[PDB]
Design a protein around this nucleic acid. Sequence first.
RNA 1: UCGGAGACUCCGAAUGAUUAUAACCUAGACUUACAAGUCAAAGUAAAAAUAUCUAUUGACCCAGAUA
Lengths: 52, 312, 100, 49, 88, 48, 141, 95
Amino acid sequence: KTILVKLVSQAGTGFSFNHKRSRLREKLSLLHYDPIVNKKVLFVEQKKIRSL
Amino acid sequence: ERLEKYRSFERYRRRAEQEARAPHWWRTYREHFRTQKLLERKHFLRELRANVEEERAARLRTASIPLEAVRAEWERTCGPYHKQRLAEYYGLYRDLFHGATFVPWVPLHVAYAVGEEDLIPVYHGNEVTPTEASRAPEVTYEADLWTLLFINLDGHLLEPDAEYVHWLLTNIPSNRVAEGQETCPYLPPFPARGSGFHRFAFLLFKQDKPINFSEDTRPSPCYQLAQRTFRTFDFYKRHQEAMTPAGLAFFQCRWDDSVTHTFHQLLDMREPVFEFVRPPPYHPKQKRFPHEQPLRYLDRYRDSHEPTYGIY
Amino acid sequence: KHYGIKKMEGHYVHAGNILGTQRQFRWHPGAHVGLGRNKCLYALEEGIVRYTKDVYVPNPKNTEAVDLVTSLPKGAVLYKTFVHVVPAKPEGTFKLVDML
Amino acid sequence: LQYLIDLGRVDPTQPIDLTQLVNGRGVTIQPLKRDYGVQLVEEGADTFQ
Amino acid sequence: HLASADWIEEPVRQKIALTHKNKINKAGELVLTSESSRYQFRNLAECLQKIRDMIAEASQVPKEPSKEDARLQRLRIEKMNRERLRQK
Amino acid sequence: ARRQAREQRIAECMAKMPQMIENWRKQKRERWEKIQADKERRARLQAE
Amino acid sequence: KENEAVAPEFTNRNPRNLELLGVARKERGWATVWPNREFWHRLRVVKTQHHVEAFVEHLNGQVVVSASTREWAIKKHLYSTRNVVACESIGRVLAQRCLEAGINFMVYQPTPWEASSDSIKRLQNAMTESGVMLREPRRIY
Amino acid sequence: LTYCSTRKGKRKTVKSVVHRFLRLHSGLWLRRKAGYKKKLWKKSTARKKRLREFVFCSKTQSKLLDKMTTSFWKRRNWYAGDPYQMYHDRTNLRV
RNA sequence: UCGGAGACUCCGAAUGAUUAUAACCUAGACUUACAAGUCAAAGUAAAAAUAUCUAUUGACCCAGAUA
Ligand SMILES: [Mg+2]
Ligand SMILES: [Mg+2]
Ligand SMILES: [Mg+2]
């Protein structure tokens, strides 16, 4: 089963977006667009929202 | 099966391109939307083969060619043919002669003088700023009478079909143009701001015999646009018997700083400024109930963006 | 669902009007007709829809299309049906904003 | 405001207040419906002399 | 009238004229208009403010032009193409 | 004060942002390079 | 003043006026069909068995300016009709014809192998150094 | 609906409407898109964009809500700084 | 209940993998009792334009979470 996780902006902003990763994979990290910063930044996994 | 199959995409592309040009009964997108000279060529080619240096350059891919010699030779043989397409593309034939087309035969060379160091050549369709056009261009061509004039196809403002001529030279004897009477004096180009690129063309007509040109003559200087304007097709029609076009050279012009001076100082009119206006956007007729439409639906149909309080 | 030709020939078509929806590439896009991800065809300029059949030349990059084209015999040339929208409006006109 | 002053329903020489607007029926106010007063508006500035 | 605009500093008047010569009328009086409201006051405010901006931009030196937009880039290419074209 | 704390917080992380992005890019390259290290090259060596 | 009188609506008759301005239309369709039709002018170069020719054509397909090695003047001055330098020479010759014509911007979409071709690369290099640009600007609304 | 209430003898507003819909004085009604806060992780970005918008009501739906609300909710409200100030009127509509 | 195929007989689903990660805003339309679900120019913004097939649903209330 796959787990829903919360990827959080590492630029110090509170912006976060939920993505899906496999429970057997390592914590996902994905460059993404932060609206507040108007620049691309790294998003790192913070919490496990649920299992789906 | 027996027929060969394309092994390369290019050959199919050539076949596909050929078919597109070829007519088809079903509706298609296109519908809706001498000998001695040749012998001389063979002798020259044989000389090229013999030349070891040419072979060495080709194998080393270091060969170079003088473009100027080819350019001069190109004008002599098929310049006319290529020049015709250039004029044909720009629609000079249709507008100037009301659909009549004449193949250029006598090369027409005109270059605008810039100071004294050099003079800008009037290449066919090339862009030339009016600022550089301040001085009357130098005209060079070979002749044994002749008439050459500058015509502004779309320059005219009041009347769309009408045109303005910078100057008209008539009864030109041989190459020399000073002897020929100057019916119209030169005026700097004056393309209006915001009217877009203006195509200015030069027409050279062979003159069989001298003809009275009292109508063509204009007061020097003439500052009346209505007096200046005439119809080229009408002018050619009057002298069509003894006048036949042989040389055509045109250039592109746009608004520039020098244009401002011309409009007021001597043209004596306020400069016209034009704005490009696209067709207003289309919306469906406004409904009393804009069901399923976002709240922005109302802002589409409100002309005034400021609050109105009515009776209150 | 309800896949069909919404706009028949001779019908005025506004910018965003959707000409038709197809489950598969029955009708291929034509001039000034964009193609949606769901493969629906939408017009791009105001015009009159006209349907024509033209030679289909695939992009070199895709392998499957190139291989099929090569497999065709030299004489044979394939065709596809296209939907076109002939523009019916001038993009802009010139007006005298002011005389200075 | 100008229309009221023109017809003699407001006395410009005297100071103006909410009482003299209501007295001249220039405005209608309902305190029970959360009215907190009258806001002047920009409509008609050009004609205002 | 710019000539009679004694209130404007004379040196800056020279700079403003040429920079925005297009807005300058034939008589030499700067002509500026705005049409964006139903109230002459707000429309007039636009007219006055543009004068202040013109004076401020002329008085101040914008040392950094930085980069240009697509429109200017196309014009620069056109000018460069013409210069090489005029070999003669 | 909260706005100033907010602003300064973002700036500090943004200053450190370029290095982290490079590190994240480096890891992806490091994973990717190793994937094909033995995906076919090891097979080619075995075939030899 | 008679001169001052001007019609409110101007009608520029130059076909190329709008295109030079940048508001002229482009074919924005043909999503599934290659080559793309998003071009005011397309420069197509055809390599034949013995000759290589380059043609610039408008949307209508009419070749405004054509450069071909088969022409007598070029081939008399050109050693071998088909050669990499010959592609270079025609590129420069076509550029001068394009520059004098006034067409400075075109779109050329070679196929992947055609792009890989050194001669096309060399010919393209001639256009760049000659000032011809192979990328046209996007239409402005 | 209470057509005649015992204590006062008047019609009674349905508060399920007051908490979901906004009436503009012209007669239009505004509403949200059902599910705009639900299962956002499986909705497409275009899908989510549509949901965030405010949508109008039909003639029937508008007629219904006008029967379920009393005249007090159909009056003119002079709120200073109202972000719906411009939308209470219809302009350039012929019909 | 949803959808694929056949002309009622068969197959699947409450999606998983791949994804150097997919913005905002906004003309016109499809579909449709309502509700839901589709496509999208322009403008603007990140970066150096569309995630990849196959196909995939659950309202309101009400409870959870966070800065
Ligand atoms: Mg009241
Ligand atoms: Mg609905
Ligand atoms: Mg867009």
